[PDB]
Amino acid sequence: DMYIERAGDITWEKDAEVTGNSPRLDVALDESGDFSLVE
Amino acid sequence: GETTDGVYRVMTRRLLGSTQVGVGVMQEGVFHTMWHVTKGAALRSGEGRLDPYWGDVKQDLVSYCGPWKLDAAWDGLSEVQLLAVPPGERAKNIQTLPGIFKTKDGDIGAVALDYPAGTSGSPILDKCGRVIGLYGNGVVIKNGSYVSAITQGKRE
Numbered sequence: 001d002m003y004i005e006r007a008g009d010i011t012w013e014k015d016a017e018v019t020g021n022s023p024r025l026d027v028a029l030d031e032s033g034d035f036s037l038v039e
Numbered sequence: 040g041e042t043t044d045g046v047y048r049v050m051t052r053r054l055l056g057s058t059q060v061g062v063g064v065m066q067e068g069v070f071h072t073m074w075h076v077t078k079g080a081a082l083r084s085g086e087g088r089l090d091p092y093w094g095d096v097k098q099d100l101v102s103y104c105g106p107w108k109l110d111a112a113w114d115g116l117s118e119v120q121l122l123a124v125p126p127g128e129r130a131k132n133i134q135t136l137p138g139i140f141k142t143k144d145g146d147i148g149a150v151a152l153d154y155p156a157g158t159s160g161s162p163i164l165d166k167c168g169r170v171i172g173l174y175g176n177g178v179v180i181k182n183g184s185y186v187s188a189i190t191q192g193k194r195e
């Protein structure tokens with residue numbers, strides 16, 4: 001069986017670690033909910 | 040049991056020890072998570088039970104106790120925060136500028152942050168703290184890195 005445990009409040013944190021890039025990808029979504037790269 | 044608004048870990052004891060298989064959002068008495076986390080199975084919250092209400096394999100979303108409540112959307116310009124809840128690790132806000140998934144049915148936001156699979160269901164937030172979608176369904180790009188979609192449901 002699965003169970004849930006509270007992990008915190010949902011709030012924006014000012015002065016948070018800014019990381020990650022913004023890539024524009026051509027993608028496809030299938031009937032099983034899986035994404036795939038189109039090239 | 041506990042229905043206070045917030046981010047929650049989705050755990051299981053079917054495997055060795057206690058394993059975190061995903062994350063979810065409690066809002067307006069509704070638990071929101073990704074379909075591949077629970078497979079639509081019932082969840083436990085202390086002594087109480089949470090039964091699925093709505094779900095969809097193609098959207099990869101599922102709600103418990105009521106209809107999907109999250110409807111805020113990414114504005115297409117601003118930075119967002121992934122409130123990442125990693126297994127065995129404390130909740131942590133990570134700020135990023137989302138990219139784009141261009142599909143045959145329109146464009147979707149995308150967050151390029153690499154986290155364990157048990158982090159799926161973590162909410163993505165706007166500057167107001169509103170949940171604009173969930174992290175955990177995406178693609179692994181050429182350089183082995185992970186890129187997730189900003190997956191948002193529909194509020195009826």
Ligand SMILES: CNC(=O)[C@H](Nc1ccc2c(c1)C(=O)OC2)c1cc(Cl)cc2[nH]ncc12
Binds near residue numbers: 155174
């Ligand atoms: C490309 N895979 C994913 O998006 C992973 N989640 C996931 C796993 C299984 C299924 C689905 C989704 C789905 O839709 O049906 C079956 C995943 C999530 C996260 Cl948070 C970090 C990850 N790092 N590598 C992979 C991965």
